[PDB]
Amino acid sequence: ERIVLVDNKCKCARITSRIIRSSEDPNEDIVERNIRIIVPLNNRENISDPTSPLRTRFVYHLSDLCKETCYTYDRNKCYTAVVPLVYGGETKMVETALTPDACYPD
Amino acid sequence: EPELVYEDLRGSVTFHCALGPEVANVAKFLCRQSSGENCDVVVNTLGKRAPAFEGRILLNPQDKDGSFSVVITGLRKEDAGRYLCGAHSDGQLQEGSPIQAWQLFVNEESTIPRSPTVVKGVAGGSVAVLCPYNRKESKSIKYWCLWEGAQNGRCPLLVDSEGWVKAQYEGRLSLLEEPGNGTFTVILNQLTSRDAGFYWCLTNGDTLWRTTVEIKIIEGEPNLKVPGNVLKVPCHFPCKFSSYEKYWCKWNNTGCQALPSQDEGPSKSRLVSLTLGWYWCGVKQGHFYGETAAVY
Amino acid sequence: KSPIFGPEEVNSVEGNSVSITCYYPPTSVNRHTRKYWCRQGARGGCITLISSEGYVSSKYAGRANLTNFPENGTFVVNIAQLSQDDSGRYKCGLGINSRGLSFDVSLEVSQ
Amino acid sequence: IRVFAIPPSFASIFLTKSTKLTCLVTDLTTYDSVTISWTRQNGEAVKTHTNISESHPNATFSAVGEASICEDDWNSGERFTCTVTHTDLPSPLKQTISRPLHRPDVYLLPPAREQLNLRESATITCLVTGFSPADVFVQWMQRGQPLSPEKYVTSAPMPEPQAPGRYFAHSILTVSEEEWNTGETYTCVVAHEALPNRVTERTVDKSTGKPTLYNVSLVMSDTAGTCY
Amino acid sequence: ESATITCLVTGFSPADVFVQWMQRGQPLSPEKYVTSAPMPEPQAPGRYFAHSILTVSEEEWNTGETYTCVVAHEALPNRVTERTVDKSTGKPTLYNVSLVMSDTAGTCY
Amino acid sequence: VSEEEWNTGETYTCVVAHEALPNRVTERTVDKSTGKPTLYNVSLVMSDTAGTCY
Ligand SMILES: *[C@@H]1O[C@H](CO)[C@@H](O[C@@H]2O[C@H](CO)[C@@H](O)[C@H](O)[C@H]2NC(C)=O)[C@H](O)[C@H]1NC(C)=O
Ligand SMILES: *[C@@H]1O[C@H](CO)[C@@H](O)[C@H](O)[C@H]1NC(C)=O
Ligand SMILES: *[C@@H]1O[C@H](CO)[C@@H](O)[C@H](O)[C@H]1NC(C)=O
Ligand SMILES: *[C@@H]1O[C@H](CO)[C@@H](O)[C@H](O)[C@H]1NC(C)=O
Numbered sequence: 002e003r004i005v006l007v008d009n010k011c012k013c014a015r016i017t018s019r020i021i022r023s024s025e026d027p028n029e030d031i032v033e034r035n036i037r038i039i040v041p042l043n044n045r046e047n048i049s050d051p052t053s054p055l056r057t058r059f060v061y062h063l064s065d066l067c068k069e070t071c072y073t074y075d076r077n078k079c080y081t082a083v084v085p086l087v088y089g090g091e092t093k094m095v096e097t098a099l100t101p102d103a104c105y106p107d
Numbered sequence: 108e109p110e111l112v113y114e115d116l117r118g119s120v121t122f123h124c125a126l127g128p129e130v131a132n133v134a135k136f137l138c139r140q141s142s143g144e145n146c147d148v149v150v151n152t153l154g155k156r157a158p159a160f161e162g163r164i165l166l167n168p169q170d171k172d173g174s175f176s177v178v179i180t181g182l183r184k185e186d187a188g189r190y191l192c193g194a195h196s197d198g199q200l201q202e203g204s205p206i207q208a209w210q211l212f213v214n215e216e217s218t219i220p221r222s223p224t225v226v227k228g229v230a231g232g233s234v235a236v237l238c239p240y241n242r243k244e245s246k247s248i249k250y251w252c253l254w255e256g257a258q259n260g261r262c263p264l265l266v267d268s269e270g271w272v273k274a275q276y277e278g279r280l281s282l283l284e285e286p287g288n289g290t291f292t293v294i295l296n297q298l299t300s301r302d303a304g305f306y307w308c309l310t311n312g313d314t315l316w317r318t319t320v321e322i323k324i325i326e327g328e329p330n331l332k333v334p335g336n337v338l339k340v341p342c343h344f345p346c347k348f349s350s351y352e353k354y355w356c357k358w359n360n361t362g363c364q365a366l367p368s369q370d371e372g373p374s375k376s377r378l379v380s381l382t383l384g385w386y387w388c389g390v391k392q393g394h395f396y397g398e399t400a401a402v403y
Numbered sequence: 404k405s406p407i408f409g410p411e412e413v414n415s416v417e418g419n420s421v422s423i424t425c426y427y428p429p430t431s432v433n434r435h436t437r438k439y440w441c442r443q444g445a446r447g448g449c450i451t452l453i454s455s456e457g458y459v460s461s462k463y464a465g466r467a468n469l470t471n472f473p474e475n476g477t478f479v480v481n482i483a484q485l486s487q488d489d490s491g492r493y494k495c496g497l498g499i500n501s502r503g504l505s506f507d508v509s510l511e512v513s514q
Numbered sequence: 515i516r517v518f519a520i521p522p523s524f525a526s527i528f529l530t531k532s533t534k535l536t537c538l539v540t541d542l543t544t545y546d547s548v549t550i551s552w553t554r555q556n557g558e559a560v561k562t563h564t565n566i567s568e569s570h571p572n573a574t575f576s577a578v579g580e581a582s583i584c585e586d587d588w589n590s591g592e593r594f595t596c597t598v599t600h601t602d603l604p605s606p607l608k609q610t611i612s613r614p615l616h617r618p619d620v621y622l623l624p625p626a627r628e629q630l631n632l633r634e635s636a637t638i639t640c641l642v643t644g645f646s647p648a649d650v651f652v653q654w655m656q657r658g659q660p661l662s663p664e665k666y667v668t669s670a671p672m673p674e675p676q677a678p679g680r681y682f683a684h685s686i687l688t689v690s691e692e693e694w695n696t697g698e699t700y701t702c703v704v705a706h707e708a709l710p711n712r713v714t715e716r717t718v719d720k721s722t723g724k725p726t727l728y729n730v731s732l733v734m735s736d737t738a739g740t741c742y
Numbered sequence: 743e744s745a746t747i748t749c750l751v752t753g754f755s756p757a758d759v760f761v762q763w764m765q766r767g768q769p770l771s772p773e774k775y776v777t778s779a780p781m782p783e784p785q786a787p788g789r790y791f792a793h794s795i796l797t798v799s800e801e802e803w804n805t806g807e808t809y810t811c812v813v814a815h816e817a818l819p820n821r822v823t824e825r826t827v828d829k830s831t832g833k834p835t836l837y838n839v840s841l842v843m844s845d846t847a848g849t850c851y
Numbered sequence: 852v853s854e855e856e857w858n859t860g861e862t863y864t865c866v867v868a869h870e871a872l873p874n875r876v877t878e879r880t881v882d883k884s885t886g887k888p889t890l891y892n893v894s895l896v897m898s899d900t901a902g903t904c905y
Contacts, residue, residue, distance in 0.1 A: 004721065013741040020721060028630055028695065034725040037905075038732035039849060044739045073741040076498075077432050100740070102436045113408050113426040113476075212408040216428040375584070405851040447900045448846070501848025502742045503904065623748065627833075628825075635785065643746060667784045669793070675776045676744070676797045684778070684793055686750075688785040729838035733905045735845050742851050762874075769873055812874065820866060822876045834884070837891035842905055844897055850904025 003035070007063075011071030013039040014061055036063065041072050048072070049080050049099065079103035109189070109210035116217040119180035119317045122209055124192035130205050131173040133194040137166075140189045140208075146200035149190075150177060153198050156257035162305030162319055166260035177260075180307070180317045181224070187213045219316055220289075226320055229327025233296040233389075233398040238308030238318045242289045247311045249282060249291055254305035262307055266293070270360040278385030279401050281362050286394040296387065296399045300324055331400040333388065340381035340402060342388035343374075351390035351397060353377060358385045358401075407506040409495050416513050420483040425495035425506055429476035436497050438471055438478045443492045443507070449500040453480065485512050515542045519596055521611040522588070525651040528705045528712065533585050537596040537609055540576040544569055545601045550579030553595045553608075589613060616680055617708045618645035622718045625694065636691045638718070640702040643682040644674065651705035652685045655715075656698050661687070694720050745803050747827060749794040749811040753786070760814035761794045764824075765807055770796070803829055857883060 003019035015037040023030050038061055045053040048071055059072060074080055080099040085092045098104040114120045122137065134153050138146025149157050150166050152175075157164075165178040179186070190211060195204035220239050228234035240249075249268040255261035266272045266282045268291075279297040286292070293308075303324035307317050332343040344353055353370070356363035368380045379388065389399030409425035423440075427433045437456055441449030452460045453467045455478065463482070471478040480495065490512045496505030519537035527533050539548060552560040560581040567576035579596055593612035600607070621643070625636035642650055648671035654661045665688065671681035685702065703715035751759055763775040775796040783789040796809060812824035852861075866878035 010741045013738075018721065018725070021727070027633075030695075030720075031727045032721070032723065032725045034728045036728070036730045036732070037849075038730070039738055039741070040732060040734040041739045042734055043736050073739050076740050076742050077430060103432045105431055105435050107431060109410065111408065111410060111424070111426075210411075212426075214406040214408070214428055215404065216406045216430075218428075443902075447902050498742060499740075499848075501846070502740075503849065503851025504742055505851075626750070629752075637750065637752065637791075639748065639750065641746070641748070665784055667781060667791075669778055669781070672776060672778065674797075675773055675795075682746075682776075682795070686784075686791070688783070724832060724835075726833045726835050727838070728835065729840065731840045731842070731905060733842035733847075733849060735848070737845070742849075764873065767873070814874070820868075820876055820878075822874055824878065834887050835889050837889065838894075839891065840894045840896070842896050844899050847896075847899060847901055847903075847905065 003033075007067050009066045010075045011069065011073060012061060012066060013041075013073045014063065014066055016063060016067065039073070044073060046070075048074060049082055051082065051099065074100050077103065109208060111210050111212070113212045113214065114182055115219055115316075116184065116213055116215050117181060117219045117221065117316070117318075118217070119178060119315065120182060120211060122177040122179070122190060122192060123174070124176060124207065125172070125174040126192075126194055126205060126207065127173065130194035131169070133204075134196055134198050135173075135175060135192065135194045136198045136200075137177055138191045138193065138200045140191055140200075146191065148199060150257050150260075151198040152258065154258045155198060160257070162254050162321065164257040164260065165262055166257050168260075178317065181319050182211070182213045184213055184215065187211055222318060222320070224319070224321055225323055227323045227325060228295075228298050229329065230298050230300060230324055232298050232327060232329050233294070233331065233400060234298070234322060235292060235294045235396045235398070236306075236308075236320050237286075237290045237292050237395070238320070239290050240308070240310045240316065241312055241314060244310065244312035244314075245287065250309035250311070251282065251293060252307035252309060254307070262309075264309075272360055278358060281356075281358060283362065283396060285396070292396055294389070294396055294399055295322075297401050298324055329400060330398050331388070333400045333402050336403040338381075338383040340383075340386075342379050342381070342400070344377035344379065344390065346376045348377065348390045348397070351392050353379045353388070353390055355379070355381055356387045356389065356399075358387060363387075405503045405505060407496055407504060409506040409508050411507070411509070413508060413510050414513060415485060417485050417487060419485060420481065421485065421510070423480045423482070423495065423508060424477050425480075425508075426477045427497055429473065433497060434473035437499075438469065438495075438497050439500060440469060440480050440493065440495050441500055443494055449494060451500060487512050487514070515602070516540055517542075517596070517598060517607050517609050519594075519609045519611045521594075521613075524649045524705065524707065527585060528651050531585070532582060533588055534580055534582045535588075535594045535596075535611060536578065536580065537611075538576070538578050539596075539598050539600075540567075541570065541572075541574045542603075543601050544573060544575040546575075548575070548577055548598050548600050550577070551597045552579060552581035553597060555593050615708045616644060616646040618642045618650060618704055618706045618714065620702070620704050620714050620716050622700075622702055622716045624718050624720075624723050625691075630691055630694060633691050635688050636694055637686045637688045638700055638702075640685040640687075640704070640716075641682075642684070642704050642706075644677060644680050645671075645682070645706055645708070646680045648681045650683055652683070653703055653705070654685070654687050655701045655703060658701075665689075697721060743800060744797055745800060746795040746797050747803075747809055747811075749796075749813075749825075751792045751794075751813055752783070753789050753791070754815055754817065755789050756816075757790055758815075759792055761792065762812055762814075763794070763796050764810050764812055774798075805829075 003017045005017050007014060007016040017035045019033045021031045040059050045051055046056055047053040081096055082099055083094050083096050085094050112120060136148055137150045138148045140146050148155060149160055150164050163180045167176045169175045190209045191206050193204045193206035195201045222239055226234045226236050251265040252262040265276055266280060268282060272280055281294050283292040303322045305319050305321055307319050309317060355366045357366055371378055385401055387399040387401045390397045406428050407425055410423060413421060415421050437454060439451050439454045441451045443449055452463045453469045455469050455471055459467060466484045467482045469480045490510055493508045493510050494505040495508055498504050517537060517539050521535050522533045550563050563580035567578060570576055591613050593610055595608045595610045597606040597608045621641045623639040623641060630636060640652055652668045654666045667686055669684035671683045674680040674682050697719040699717050699719040701715055701717040703713055705712050749761060757780045761777045763770045775794055778793040780790050780792045783791050808826045808828055810824050810826040814822055860882060862880045862882050864878045864880045866876060868876050
């Protein structure tokens with residue numbers, strides 16, 4: 002019944018809207034603004050560099066996500082970083098997988 | 108019991124209605140059991156169809172086993188419920204009728220790309236549509252189609268990729284391949300008031316998205332000016348096609364092969380020559396194709 | 404709306420077996436992400452009876468297997484030896500138990 | 515006796531792309547052999563101008579000419595001079611017309627709540643501000659369909675009170691109040707010269723506009739971070 | 743940057759309305775607001791409509807004051823009527839915040 | 852007024868005609884909804900079992 006205005010998935014906001022066809026009086030129908038933020042609370046600031054500080058401020062300007070610094074990983078998009086792991090002589094900098102089950106190559 | 112059918116948004120579905128030798132000559136149908144008890148019928152064999160499913164339902168002919176099949180295409184989000192083929196006389200859902208249900212689901216997380224459904228062409232003008240197809244299934248035999256009702260439920264082949272064009276479309280029709288990597292283009296010009304309709308982009312692949320595109324023949328003027336029916340032949344291009352590459356073809360069942368010409372300056376826009384069956388002088392934008400006009 | 408789609412209503416007599424297929428949009432996450440079959444109880448939540456990574460619960464041990472056909476785009480749950488405690492409200496799904504991406508099967512056993 | 519020359523408008527370039535410089539040679543002496551000619555600065559002739567008018571009800575001859583030249587042959591200052599020879603005029607009389615930017619901010623305003631209690635008629639207001647120079651076009655479409663032009667009215671580009679020489683315009687469209695349970699979304703598309711498409715279509719329905727019931731619902735969770 | 747509050751004078755006959763724009767009681771400058779010309783109504787035959795705009799800053803609407811639109815026409819029984827706006831001239835708007843801190847009770851795709 | 856008549860609507864203008872107003876007449880109005888300043892209910896749900904989606 003409702004229409005998704007915003008389905009932003011790197012802050013995880015999800016503003017929708019819906020006209021409530023009321024008790025059958027005149028046009029005293031209401032319109033909604035069902036915001037649904039989901040706050041990470043253990044993701045870092047730089048989402049891809051996991052050696053960063055945690056987070057305190059979560060700022061949601063809901064114009065600037067109706068038209069960046071993402072707070073959550075997106076599920077389908079896959080994230081990486083590069084670490085210096087060694088094994089013997091060399092420091093072979095190979096490419097990890099921050100979120101797995103999404104970085105599986107075809 | 109349901110026979111769950113998880114199909115795609117802007118994809119297509121094939122209901123395989125298989126029934127018995129008691130119900131071969133009974134007038135088969137496909138209702139759609141909606142929110143009460145009633146079946147708002149969708150096809151029939153005695154004539155009916157829906158105001159909704161225009162251009163899309165193809166009730167295939169019967170077999171000797173009575174196993175007629177039904178194609179729906181261009182499924183939108185409001186098709187996502189129980190369907191019911193059956194065999195009663197008067198083509199409505201009644202009791203005593205050997206029904207056999209299904210259950211669709213039209214998922215909204217498609218990988219199918221969003222091609223334009225309405226192509227608007229002016230009369231005696233040009234249309235150039237792209238039909239998308241599965242990028243894995245690149246090496247296959249394309250086809251095209253007309254639309255002829257549901258109780259007929261027909262879709263005869265206009266062109267293909269092997270080469271065979273219908274004789275009543277020769278000269279004005281070419282199936283292309285460029286751009287590859289996902290699409291195939293068909294250009295149709297020399298339009299007519301009655302060749303507006305619903306036009307299906309078949310392929311000989313395994314999993315098929317029978318894309319239906321809709322030609323709207325409006326009134327209009329041609330965007331391209333060419334002699335009537337004609338050694339040098341001219342072709343007069345508007346200034347909107349400034350980036351577009353101006354070129355002539357030699358039409359056959361094999362498509363377009365290139366033919367040279369020399370360019371002028373300002374000409375009341377652009378004018379090209381054909382210094383030297385049916386031949387055209389279309390335009391090309393990088394990799395896609397646009398307005399072509401034919402001459403004898 | 405969550406794009407998994409299973410059988411909405413399943414009926415099978417005690418002692419007999421059940422095969423429940425649930426479909427997913429064959430992405431490259433959904434091919435490889437965890438696929439569960441949880442029992443939505445009363446007072447709360449899913450209790451994962453048989454995951455696809457390889458957990459199989461204390462109840463469904465020896466009688467259930469969940470397999471996964473990622474090219475077919477579906478995963479199938481076979482459950483033998485039903486009883487009447489196998490009746491109630493189930494979900495077939497992907498990812499974490501809480502976050503949706505699921506479908507609601509209603510298992511209903513008969514005598 | 516008036517040889518008055520009307521050059522074309524953006525509402526004719528957009529609607530027809532048949533840009534044409536006209537001059538009415540009317541209220542002169544009621545006679546024939548009054549020959550039209552539209553002469554440029556360079557000296558190129560014009561096309562087949564026909565479709566003359568009959569005599570005035572006040573017993574004078576009315577005649578008209580045509581000159582259908584291209585668009586950037588009009589925006590590039592190509593002056594035109596229409597010349598005619600009459601019976602009282604021993605010389606032909608010449609009359610010249612020629613060519614002498616900012617973008618429009620379009621806002622669309624819904625019907626006010628005081629108006630939606632008389633239960634009669636809702637007037638949706640397009641509003642085309644802050645642009646220069648004048649002669650914008652505005653047309654009103656409902657589900658991709660040009661509406662009846664007697665149903666709406668467009669104002670004229672009166673100058674802006676604050677910005678120096680910018681020109682704002684209005685337009686209103688009067689619909690049934692009974693339409694505003696069902697909506698039909700009411701696009702109003704403007705047409706100006708400082709635009710890519712020359713189209714800045716906007717739309718407002720009942721579904722747009724102010725909410726009068728929020729509900730934030732923000733959930734918090736240690737192990738989130740995937741945003742399904 | 744700005745805000746053009748508009749005054750919509752519908753449904754009247756005959757022509758020649760006046761429109762002026764008071765702020766709190768002292769009428770504003772005649773170079774701030776702009777009144778159109780009268781013009782006949784597209785739907786109704788024997789009526790008209792006029793208009794006005796008043797251009798104010800964003801802050802002077804985000805502060806308070808009223809900007810009332812007082813008209814003058816020879817068929818009103820007192821021969822002046824007026825309406826007003828404000829930043830807060832709409833409706834109730836109940837908010838309904840719902841902060842969830844349970845780390846188990848989860849969401850719905 | 853009768854009490855229910857105030858509970859329907861009725862914008863109830865009070866027009867005051869003085870000989871020293873700017874244009875000699877002002878008029879002001881009230882109905883029941885001229886205040887009501889954004890009633891907002893917070894609702895913290897912590898540690899709670901519902902099973903309903905959020
Ligand atoms: C921290 O964030 C920065 C930007 O905010 C990230 O940026 C660069 O990211 C690309 C993509 O992997 C790398 O190829 C660049 O080398 C990064 N720049 C630098 C200076 O490292 C960055 O990924 C994050 N930090 C780390 C260490 O990954
Ligand atoms: C938001 O408000 C609507 C209408 O009042 C209500 O149905 C919905 O449940 C609310 N949102 C949440 C998350 O409860
Ligand atoms: C918001 O209010 C609606 C109705 O006003 C109510 O149904 C809903 O539960 C509220 N939303 C919450 C508590 O998240
Ligand atoms: C919030 O308030 C609205 C009305 O004021 C009411 O409908 C709703 O149930 C309330 N919800 C909570 C959770 O307080």
